Paper text:
The largest cohort of CRL SRs recognizing terminal degrons are the four BC-box proteins in the KLHDC-family (hereafter collectively referred to as KLHDCX), KLHDC1, KLHDC2, KLHDC3, and KLHDC1031,32. These SRs all feature Kelch-type 6-bladed β-propellers that recognize C-degrons bearing terminal Gly residues. Members of the KLHDCX family employ Kelch-type 6-bladed β-propellers to bind substrates, and a BC-box binding EloB/C that serve as bridges to a cullin (CUL2 or CUL5). Importantly, we discovered that these E3s share a defining C-terminal carboxylate-anchoring element (R/F-S-R) establishing them as C-degron E3s.
To understand the basis for C-degron recognition by KLHDC3, we crystallized and solved the structure of a monomeric version of KLHDC3-EloB/C bound to ubiquitin at 2.0 Å resolution. Blades 1–5 contain β-strands that are contiguous in sequence, whereas blade 6 contains three strands that progress into the BC-box, and an outer so-called “Velcro” strand from the N-terminus of the domain that fastens the β-propeller. Together, the blades adopt a funnel-like propeller shape that engages three major surfaces of ubiquitin: the C-terminal di-Gly motif occupies the bottom of the funnel; ubiquitin’s preceding C-terminal tail residues bind in the funnel stem; and ubiquitin’s globular domain engages the top. The KLHDC3 C-degron-binding site is formed by two distinct chambers, which are separated by a ridge-like feature and analogous to those in KLHDC2 termed the N- and C-chamber. Residues that precede the substrate’s di-Gly bind in KLHDC3’s N-chamber, while the degron’s C-terminal di-Gly motif is buried deep within the C-chamber. At the bottom of the C-chamber, a basic patch engages the substrate’s extreme C-terminal carboxyl group. Key contacts are made by a KLHDC3 RSR motif (Arg240, Ser241, and Arg292), all located within blade 5. The structure explains KLHDC3’s strict requirement for its substrates to terminate with a C-terminal Gly: its Cα is tightly wedged in the stem of the KLHDC3 funnel-like structure, which would exclude any side-chain larger than a hydrogen. The penultimate Gly is stabilized by a hydrogen bond between its backbone carbonyl and Arg292 from KLHDC3’s RSR motif. Asn16 at the bottom of KLHDC3’s N-chamber pocket forms a hydrogen bond with the carbonyl of ubiquitin’s Arg74, and also interacts with the carbonyl of ubiquitin’s Leu73 through a water-mediated hydrogen bond. Finally, loops connecting KLHDC3 form the top of the funnel-shaped substrate-binding site, and approach several residues from the globular domain of ubiquitin.
Author numbering:
A (entry chain D): 1 to 76
B (entry chain B): 1 to 97
C (entry chain A): 1 to 313, 322 to 377
D (entry chain C): 17 to 50, 58 to 112
Write the structure that this text describes.
Amino acid sequence: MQIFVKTLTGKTITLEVEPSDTIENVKAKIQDKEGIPPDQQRLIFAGKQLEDGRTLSDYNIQKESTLHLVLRLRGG
Amino acid sequence: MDVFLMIRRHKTTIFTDAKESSTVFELKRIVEGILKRPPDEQRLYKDDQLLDDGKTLGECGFTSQTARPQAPATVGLAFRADDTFEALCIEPFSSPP
Amino acid sequence: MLRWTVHLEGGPRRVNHAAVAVGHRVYSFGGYCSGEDYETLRQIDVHIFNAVSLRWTKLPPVKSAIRGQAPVVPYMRYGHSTVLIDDTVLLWGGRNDTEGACNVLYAFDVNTHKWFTPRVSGTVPGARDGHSACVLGKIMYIFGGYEQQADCFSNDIHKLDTSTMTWTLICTKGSPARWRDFHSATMLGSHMYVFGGRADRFGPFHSNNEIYCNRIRVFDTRTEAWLDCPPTPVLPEGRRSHSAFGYNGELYIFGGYNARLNRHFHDLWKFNPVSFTWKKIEPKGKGPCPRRRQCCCIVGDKIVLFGGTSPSPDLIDHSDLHILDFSPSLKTLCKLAVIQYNLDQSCLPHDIRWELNAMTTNSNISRPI
Amino acid sequence: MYVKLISSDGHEFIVKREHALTSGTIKAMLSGPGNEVNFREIPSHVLSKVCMYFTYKVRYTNSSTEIPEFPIAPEIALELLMAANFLDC
């Protein structure tokens, strides 16, 4: 599965994942691609916050979906 | 609405303000309070144009947009000498090097 | 009329710091900076800008008072607040990347530069960052921010009565300002004016419905009520991480960031609480570039504005400082002209030459990256 | 109501006392022990500009409407700076 992760500003990151992969795995892959530590990442789909324990298939996230990424505002 | 002025005679310069709607005569009464000569002994000028007592400053051409506090408009002043009036004479300011 | 009269470099390179003016000296605490360490054990920082000599200095590290006992000093953090009451700075909230947010109250004596943690009672507000803080007499008012433990935006007001060091969660009347962070709150008389900030359009949780507030909200500290206020036909664009300050009875807001527009600001807006109206103001001179989460502090008729972050010509952190002078003297205007026209200064008297030097010499806290 | 400020070259500038109090130095002189002030080191082309600054400062204090700046030409900037420092305005 190919999924997309977009911050509110507009940067888009394409990730290669399986529906079995957990949200912790997705944040880890985002850290590999963008260098953002997982504890500074908040992932949202369909207006709900995605918990690290569950996987992508648990949240009905299929191929070509976009997740919304919220980041810690260290610079306000 | 307000005009900012320099009233100038010889080596005298009065800084004052007045309304566009105020009269030349009212301006002469300000001069009288400061320089102790009555309005009938004064002539006021916009450049070489002698101004009439009953005209407003606006009617004389003074406008708020061209008589700003940081760039006031000049009104020339001449006093009656004995039976006639002195020539309008304004001494220039000094010069930078 | 109002003018940007000083632009200096070489200061602390910080965004999301907090600062207060103590007389003619601005005290700046902590803040974030890219590439620098916010994980390991580090003391918070204090830099002092002297608004007369126009010089930055930095205080040395806090030492242990007694053997074994750790130095008493907040850990390095960003997103905290600082307010001044008499000789005491009260520092509260904020976070780093490791220990998260903290809710221990810290007090810093502006004359001895000693830190302490006064014993507090009452309902201590949850740890958070991006809250606002302001004071009326001996009372500090905390509003909003993002709570770390509850993991949500706040719209509570907690007051700290410093006479007894007692926290109280205020049971307010009226409709509270929407849960938000990185807003401002400013006291004009007895009323607290809350402007801007990031929020969610439906409630207190992130839900991918992020909005930027621009409807000013007013809290009366006397009745402890949120007021219903008249419409403002003109108003600034919504934004977070602007600076707000109260000057001569009116509220001013500078700069900030709107993520819906992806826009940084360097505008200046004035709110007159009596007519309850907004007006955009254009200072003379070249301002700071559009930026967010700078700090602004009032010194007399001047605003000291410094730090912040902005997009790089991908963000840069600012080490510069700007002075906005609400009432420039002729001496200030002439100094600017002498500088602008590159005139020979060597025949000026030494007192004026010292002033010209002060406004044209960078400090050495930082160097270009 | 009005005071007289005399330049080094003998020009007499008559300005409102309240406007002249923009200068700390003139304010102190008008309340000296035991009117008019004579400035032996400020020439008329400089002192006239100073008086314009007085008018401007008083008119536009606590003003938020867009207004022109106070213009300072290069040829006068050093002298005007020296006068402003001496006059504390």
